[PDB]
Amino acid sequence: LTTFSLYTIIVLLVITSLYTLTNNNNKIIGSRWLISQEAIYDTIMNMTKGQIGGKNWGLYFPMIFTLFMFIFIANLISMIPYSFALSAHLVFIISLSIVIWLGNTILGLYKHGWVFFSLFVPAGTPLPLVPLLVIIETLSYFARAISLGLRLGSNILAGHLLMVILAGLTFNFMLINLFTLVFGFVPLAMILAIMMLEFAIGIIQGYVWAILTASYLKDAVYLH
């Protein structure tokens, strides 16, 4: 088993603990900790009902929920100082994006036939640009394929690598003459702030993924 595999097991066990014994006694009012994952439940309920509302909304709610929760946990766990970055293996995140994009294309073809490509005929316009708006709509349609993945990957990777570069630099900042030990707090404070910011952009990315691939799924489920 690889380093990546070992940390995927660790992520799975973290997620298991968040419901298995986060709810003590299966209390009616429920333990205070489960109130957090209740609020998460409600804001993704109202988001994917907000997006892909309709008869099939709750039929895609487990999928949109594990797309929140995977990215939400994996951009907190990966932010631990000595923990192996699964997400810094871009190939899992980019593959998941392509899979969902292809799984939108297949769903679209299945659900809406060969008139699936009428999704890429947007609306009435004067006739010399009716075909044009199909070409540079389809160009944008498989720009949707990679965009969703490349957002999350770039942000998370750049955060960890930035932090490590500054951390190594402040190490060598504190290995020069003793006057640097005095008032060497300003670069340390920058690293503290960067670590604080990285939790934020990880939760922001975890929500933004699951809404954006609700927007693509909105297009696929309901043509226009």
Partner: protein
């Protein structure tokens, strides 16, 4: 490419898709209905 050109791409991707299927099933069959149980139990008390 600090680990972005291994040959272990398929190793990574295999364990990756295994984790997704596990979490999908796990949420859907176990834990999501345990939240929906809280909602419904609360609503049953509300109705009662």
């Amino acid at each position: 490419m600090p680990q972005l050109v291994p040959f272990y791409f398929m190793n990574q991707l295999t364990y990756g898709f295994l984790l997704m299927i596990t979490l999908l099933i796990l949420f859907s069959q176990f834990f999501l209905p345990m939240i929906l149980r809280l909602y419904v139990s609360r609503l049953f008390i509300s109705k009662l």
